[PDB]
Subunit: 91 residues, 4 copies
């Protein structure tokens, strides 16, 4: 769909050059560097929600999902897993 | 797709009975109660990643996205916004 | 001082009965259960700060430090370590 | 004791030059910039605990408490409040 393409792009540059891209620099830095970002975006999501800044909220929630996908890719998993897991629950 | 249906389901019971469902109890409790859960799942995502528990990771990341969607719905927004925001960036 | 006494109390019931106390139940539950709480109080601290609820802020920051101390105790460490580490930096 | 001195130092440079110190730059940046740090150190505390890196754990928990104090100072409060609040509970 859209996430699949992003996932494929992530896996593509999974083991690319550290300077190649941002996603590449993350993967090279490691698990911690990725988790930092996840936590960061999660906190910003809270802040955004509190400030009723609906535009910032969406940007952060997106940045959160994105880094979450970067994390999944680091663990040899991918979006669909999460989507299917979501499906398995509700509905 | 799958998220759209979940979103529609969330909006449906947005102002339902507090005892109707879990999602309903959350909405009734408020913003804070929703944010607690978002933060919770974010933390668990970190723990899961560290423990290399790939199955727990996916379950949590999904619970995170789910509550993130609950948050969006609380603010009169929805998944597609995040998906399109994701598209606007990468690609 | 005050933290020392709390620390001593924590270490005291470190390996007590699971039903003995709350602190005891935590230790029995494990590392994760303790980290959940640390993250929870951290999030609430953010929320409280945002809502300018100065009384709730102090209650949460305290709950945070407390669980942080429970964490340290779980790792065979203690408050003074943190205090001294704080001293070593500023001043 | 030790925290009191740090608190006093924080309040001292509360409204100092943005370039004066790190604590000064934070206060100038705002509430959000301080909350970012609190969340950051909280997440690092989780990571450290998981990696059993006991030395990093104490360094982070201390950085956490420190930024928590910076937060308190930003809200015209101070350490003793948290310490007393801690006392009021246990013991």
């Amino acid at each position: 769909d859209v996430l699949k393409n992003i996932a494929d792009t992530l896996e593509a540059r999974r083991e690319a050059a550290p300077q190649s891209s941002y996603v590449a620099s993350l993967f090279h830095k490691g698990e911690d560097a990725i988790l930092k970002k996840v936590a960061e975006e999660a906190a910003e999501t809270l802040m955004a929600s509190k400030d009723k800044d609906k535009l910032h909220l969406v940007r952060e929630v997106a940045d959160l999902w994105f880094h979450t996908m970067v994390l999944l890719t680091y663990h040899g998993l991918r979006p669909e897993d999460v989507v299917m897991e979501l499906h398995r629950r509700e509905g």
